[PDB]
Amino acid sequence: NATEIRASVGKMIDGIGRFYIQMCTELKLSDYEGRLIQNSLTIERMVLSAFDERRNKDPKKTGGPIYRRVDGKWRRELILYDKEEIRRIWRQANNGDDATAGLTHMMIWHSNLNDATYQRTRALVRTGMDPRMCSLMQGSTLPRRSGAAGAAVKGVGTMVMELIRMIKRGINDRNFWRGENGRRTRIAYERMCNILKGKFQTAAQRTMVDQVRESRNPGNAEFEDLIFLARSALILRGSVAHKSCLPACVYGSAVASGYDFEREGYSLVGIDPFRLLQNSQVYSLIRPNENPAHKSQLVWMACHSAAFEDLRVSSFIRGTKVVPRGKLSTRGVQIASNENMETMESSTLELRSRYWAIRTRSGGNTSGQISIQPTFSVQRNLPFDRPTIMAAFSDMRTEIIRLMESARPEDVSFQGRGVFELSDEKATSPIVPSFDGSYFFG
Amino acid sequence: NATEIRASVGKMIDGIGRFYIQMCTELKLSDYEGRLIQNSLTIERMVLSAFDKKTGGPIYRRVDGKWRRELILYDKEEIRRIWRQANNGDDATAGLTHMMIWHSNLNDATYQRTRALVRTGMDPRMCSLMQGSTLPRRSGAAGAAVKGVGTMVMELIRMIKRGINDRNFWRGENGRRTRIAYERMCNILKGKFQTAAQRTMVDQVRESRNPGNAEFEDLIFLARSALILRGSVAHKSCLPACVYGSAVASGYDFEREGYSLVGIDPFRLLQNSQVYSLIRPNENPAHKSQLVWMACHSAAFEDLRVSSFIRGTKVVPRGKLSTRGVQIASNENMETMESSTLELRSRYWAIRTRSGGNSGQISIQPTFSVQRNLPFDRPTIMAAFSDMRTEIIRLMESARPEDVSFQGRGVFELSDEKATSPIVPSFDMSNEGSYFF
Amino acid sequence: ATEIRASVGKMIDGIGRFYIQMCTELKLSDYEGRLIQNSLTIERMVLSAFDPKKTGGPIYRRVDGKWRRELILYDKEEIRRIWRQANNGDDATAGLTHMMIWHSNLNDATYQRTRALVRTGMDPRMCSLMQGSTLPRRSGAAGAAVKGVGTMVMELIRMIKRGINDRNFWRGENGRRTRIAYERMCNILKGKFQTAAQRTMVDQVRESRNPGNAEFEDLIFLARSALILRGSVAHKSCLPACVYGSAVASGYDFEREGYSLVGIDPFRLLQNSQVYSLIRPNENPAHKSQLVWMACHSAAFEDLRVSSFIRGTKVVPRGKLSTRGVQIASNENMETMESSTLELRSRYWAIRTRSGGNSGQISIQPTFSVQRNLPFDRPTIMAASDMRTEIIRLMESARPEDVSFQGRGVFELSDEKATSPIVPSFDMSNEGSYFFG
Ligand SMILES: CC(C)(C)c1ccc(C(=O)Nc2ccc(NC(=O)c3ccc4c(c3)OCCO4)cc2)cc1
Ligand SMILES: CC(C)(C)c1ccc(C(=O)Nc2ccc(NC(=O)c3ccc4c(c3)OCCO4)cc2)cc1
Ligand SMILES: CC(C)(C)c1ccc(C(=O)Nc2ccc(NC(=O)c3ccc4c(c3)OCCO4)cc2)cc1
């Protein structure tokens, strides 16, 4: 049954790979051009665009920039395709299945890339949220209705942001909560509360989300409750899925080598993506301004959903220093329409790493003794568990402040868990780091 | 007069030592065997048992390169007689009590008492309050000093329930004497509390005519309060008999020299003594060692950080401790049994306290531009700004886990006999972890 | 900015030159010139000269293997003269003030001042607020920067009480000039507060036309508040004159080279200078050393763990400190008096602050299953009309274990330009590392 999942993920990767190969054939891209991440992005965006039901209710066409190697120089062409031609090729590549999962996979890869490329300081202040809540904004770029995969991967902040957005619409325009489809806007609000509720790993945070969901007329008080909850999630962190989702060319490349993902199985959270990246070859266009090592770090972080991970941890796994966004001499992977193709060079993206680690959906949340009884006449504090003991007596906000105050930045999580060698396939022999400088953005 | 007490406890220790030597001679134990802590336990249990027609238990011998367990038997009368002879014809209640309290300290450090707590309607996380829960219900004044707030609540809950179920418990000639016992226990509990409010609530519970469900609820509330407004509980370093016996066999004169259960003396005695333990296949000797050390100093429910600092080695939580306890069961396999030196020494010593915590500087003014917290004494400063449960919740809510207690008090060097130069522990380079259980 | 270094340089030059001239006039040996007791006397002679029309004090001499304490006398005019010559005819008020602050720092580190505090209706536990309480009431701008909130409050209470006793203090032509003194002092206090609330309450006090018992109460409240919402108080490393004297004699050119009271300069100067001290028979030289070190760097009220870290040896509480103070009283026995080198060096340096403490990512979201702590910025996150009430609210909110000076580190003594901060890792649960109590 573990292997049933590996086979289905395997099948999904296969599909994306096949589709990528087919798209390279139709565009008559060389093997070199096919491994250009910029070309991967365009091909990806085209297929997603082709299925965007929302958007598609010519403008019956899709496209974007394709890049070509023309005597060792890079030339940008803008191409155009029929959404129904691309939808047709996608289904053929996926054996007639509609392969929603594969579409969602590529979405989640874009999201991870967005989370690693753009601080969302603008979006946060315009919502009345604190711009320092950016570690909470995983998946803030995904479409509002996404997979179950879409929801697993969204951050607590993303979910709060979406709920705030709705509450505000309702305050400005007092007809948002009404109409014939008022009942379905209401269920949408409750649905999002429950998603949020399910990310929280304490009774008190879960109870506060119940209060918010159950709110008759959601307004300014619920705004305030949600801001408080988002703040709390900076310390009592929510469970957020982390999925290593790679550009389509990498899967395409591997399928073209005769790699059989379905037979072999595949996991977004185990060794597989690390192994696949150890042996794949991806190029990127790169601006004269830009350090290739920095471009490389960007994609690496995106590939493993690591924007908001401790740079210490990221560095240790990677074997190269993973550097803060403020020290990073690169602007991001897509190339604008106004950029001059003539001074554009290209390098190999370093996407490998020293070790691997499993990806978690955990936030790090941890009878028995809850106080000390002093034995020795010695100057010190006398520890006790203030959240639990005082819990015996009136607000959710008070319980949560207590827990937040109880938590200490130096509390250790994931006790026993470690990184692994790329030769340690079955994750037998953890290597626990020792650490002495940790946030990507700030 | 300080030195009067030292002499008295010295005389008690002497007696235990002499008794132990005399038992080792009767059993023809080698010096190694005499320092086996399992042997010490049996000998201890025999003498206590003799004062509660035959008595005995497992004695362990090194025979043909192996540890052999034999089961020995003695007349209570013969053991009593040897005890009195060892103690110069005194009855030596105190010496009996001392061994009892050692057993208790060992029990407290070996076994969480989760079972007992839930069966009483008490929360299993109240185990820091359960010191001495294993002692017999009537023991010394020494007995009662050493018993925890939780132990005392548990005893009074047990008695309230007996009175509910059997409505003849509080009535008759029997009921005059059970009543005085209930009051006596309420006073003992009262005397351990260090706030007027907690004391008043114990007065209300005592003064209850017909103690039932309301008093039960008062007592659990009190116990819960004692997790923050902690009670006074005596801590006494009481060592296995073999250690005293060993010392006495060296010509140590406890009566002339004097002894203290709360100053340097047990730490000095442990620096230079040598105890062994049987040890099971899966067991780490350093972990067995930590167990006995904690027991010896009554430190089961102390902050592991404090215990580490004094000891000089990491004192690790019960859940991370590869050992199962010091007595060996009768169905255990003696063939797989090895033995090791218990490491019972320590880097420093500290005075043992009966206190449970709470001019002079009460704040720091930063001088240097350096990353750190800025201490101040929040209890004292905020103190500048009529139902008893409400008063107590107010105090609990005031308190903070990082409030400092025992201001000015610190550990000592083993060469600082007179307790001249306290050293305040810092826990900066130290790794976290406060609760043994 | 290099104009300031040059002017502080010029001031230091002057003190050094003056000290060298005074050592010549007294015919002091190299050794005697570097004796801190002789430095103190020469210092308080010059200060005294600018306060019969004689001045002087104890000068100590190494004569035939014995320390001889002789009393010298001088005309205030002669010493004023020498001072101005040394300072090229400037009247070097700043230099006089520098020495005053050194004596103040030495006072703060030697004496608790519990007497003065009760006699003003202040709490004797307010001693962390009493930096500079020994300075003259008017001492230049340097004087005022260095004075604590408590000192300021104490001086305003002194003035309120003069106004109560003499019910025409506030009144006439002399009542206009006492009024401006009061307002000046209120403004100095106001400027040290880093909250709107505290500042508004100082406005209320200043604007009182007839200050009495209500303003007293307001100022005690404010002093209590500064134990948690701390004032800005300058810290200035001011060394004994003999150190500067020594340095000038070595051909150090403080005016060309520049100098800072808050940067590396005083640490470098002390690292490589050599100061001696008389020491009584029951005194530990290491302890005397600590005292002088703390005074030099104005560290009396600093967290001992911070002082310990910078210094490289344990900086020990005042109660554990075997020394009685640097001056020697007239009835002390010179025959039993020995002398040692003060250990004034340190392992690192740290910038001195005038601060009191208190967008981007402020927390981590774990991506990999890997053992580690989970950083977040606790102070920032947790941070989320009657002035008294506003202040009590903020005092009650504050957490002693909040970190201040985030990112700020110590430096190597080679690191002039403060290039490479080394950030220590203190335990934030620790709120006990006070010099006094
Ligand atoms: C997240 C999904 C798509 C499954 C969803 C779930 C519920 C709803 C909904 O609109 N209404 C609703 C009403 C009550 C609840 N209650 C709980 O979800 C709930 C109540 C108690 C719980 C708990 C969940 O988690 C496990 C233990 O405790 C949930 C949803 C919408 C979407
Ligand atoms: C030590 C003094 C000088 C008081 C002394 C004691 C006993 C004797 C003596 O005549 N007999 C004697 C009998 C027994 C012992 N000791 C033990 O049999 C014995 C005593 C204590 C033991 C032990 C073995 O095992 C290890 C430590 O605990 C020692 C001497 C002579 C001097
Ligand atoms: C600590 C007391 C004095 C209570 C004590 C300790 C151990 C014993 C004991 O049974 N044996 C024992 C063995 C060695 C020693 N002590 C020393 O070897 C010793 C003790 C102190 C010393 C010293 C050596 O030299 C360095 C510092 O001063 C003391 C007792 C008896 C009494």
Residue numbers in the entry:
A (entry chain C): 21 to 77, 88 to 396, 403 to 429, 438 to 480, 485 to 490
B (entry chain A): 21 to 72, 90 to 395, 403 to 429, 438 to 489
C (entry chain B): 22 to 72, 89 to 395, 403 to 428, 438 to 490
Task: Provide the publication's sentences verbatim.
Following increased insights into the importance of vRNPs, antiviral drugs that target nucleoprotein (NP) are an attractive strategy as NP is a highly conserved multifunctional protein that plays an essential role in infection by all subtypes of IAVs during the virus infection life cycle. NP was reported to interact with RNA and oligomerize by self-interaction to form an oligomer to maintain the structure of RNP. In addition, NP is essential for viral transcription and replication; the major role of NP is the encapsidation of RNA into an RNP complex and maintenance of the conformation of the RNA template in a suitable order for transcription, replication, and assembly into virions. Furthermore, NP or RNPs participate in translocation between the cytoplasm and nucleus with the help of other viral proteins and host factors.
Here, we characterized a novel influenza A virus nucleoprotein (NP) inhibitor, FA-6005, that inhibited a broad spectrum of human pandemic and seasonal influenza A and B viruses in vitro and protects mice against lethal influenza A virus challenge. To obtain structural insights into the interaction between NP and FA-6005, FA-6005 was cocrystallized with NP, and the complex structure was determined. The NP/FA-6005 complex crystal belongs to space group C2221, with only one NP trimer in each asymmetric unit. Three FA-6005 molecules were found in each trimer. One was in the I41 pocket, and the major interactions involved in the I41 pocket included (i) hydrophobic interactions of the t-butyl group with G288, V285, and A286, ring C with I41, and ring D with G54 and R55; (ii) hydrogen bonding between amide O2 and T45; and (iii) dipole-dipole interactions of ring D with D51 and S283. The second one was in the Y289 pocket, and the interactions involved in the Y289 pocket included hydrophobic interactions of the t-butyl group and ring A with Y289, R305, and L306 and rings A and B with N309. The third one was around N224. However, N224 might not be a real pocket since the compound is seated between two symmetry-related NP molecules. We found that in the presence of FA-6005, mutation of residues in the I41 pocket displayed high resistance, while that of residues in the Y289 pocket exhibited more tolerance to the compound. FA-6005 would bind on the external surface of the NP, and thus, it may not interfere with the interaction between NPs during oligomerization.
